[PDB]
Structures are given as structure tokens and as C-alpha cells.
């Protein structure tokens, strides 16, 4: 989608 698994760490 757009590096969602990545946004998971951003949080």
C-alpha cells in the first residue's frame, strides 16, 4: 500500500 508495516514503527 504505502509502507504501512513501516508506519507501524513510526507510531
Swiss-Prot record:
The record marks 9 as: Implicated in free radical propagation. It comes from the Eukaryota. The record marks 11 as: Susceptible to oxidation. This is P3(40). It comes from Homo sapiens. The gene is APP. The chain holds residues 696 to 706 of 770 of the full protein.
Amino acid at each position: 500500500g504505502s509502507n504501512k508495516g513501516a508506519i507501524i514503527g513510526l507510531m
